[PDB]
């Protein structure tokens, strides 16, 4: 085959594919994040990954390191918690799941939408790579210098 199709640029982020993890009680699930564009920052036109809102935190702080860079709220609110020993109290229903799956989705969306963050690396990390690499290693990093 061959194929060939395009037309103006778009750079969306899709997130479904919730797949549930662990077993017992306090459980979290994971989205597919299959992202599409055309634009020559990114060198994969399409790539899958598997990634959760969790996660997304510690991209998102990534992104909220310094560098002038707006980066939109995450979807979710907890706060009260002395000791890391309790978490979700009883939680499972698709609408929690679609309020997170769609949120996080529309926040990358967005997200995505950022010059500063096209340039970001951790950005293309958390997508194109499916397992990130805490303190990766640098390198080409888009159109450098310029």
Same mark, same amino acid.
């Given at each position: ?20 993890? &662990? ?12 992202? !599409?564009?055309? /634009?020559?920052? *990114?060198?994969? =036109? ?40 309790? &978490? ?12 997170? !799956?769609?949120? /996080?989705?529309? *926040?990358?969306? =967005? ?36």
């Amino acid at each position: 085959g061959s194929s060939g199709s395009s037309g103006s640029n778009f750079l969306e982020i899709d997130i479904f594919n919730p797949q549930t993890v &662990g077993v017992g009680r306090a459980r979290f699930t994971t989205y597919e994040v299959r992202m !599409r564009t055309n /634009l020559p920052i *990114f060198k994969l =036109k399409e790539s899958c990954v598997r990634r959760r809102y969790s996660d997304f935190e510690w991209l998102k702080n990534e992104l909220e390191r310094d560098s002038k860079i707006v980066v939109p709220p995450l979807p979710g609110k907890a706060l009260k918690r002395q000791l890391p020993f309790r &978490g979700d109290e009883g939680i499972f229903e698709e609408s929690f799941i679609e309020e997170r !799956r769609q949120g /996080l989705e529309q *926040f990358i969306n =967005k997200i995505a939408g950022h010059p500063l963050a096209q340039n970001e690396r951790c950005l293309h990390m958390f997508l194109q790579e499916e397992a990130i690499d805490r303190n990766y290693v640098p390198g080409k990093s888009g159109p450098s210098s310029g």
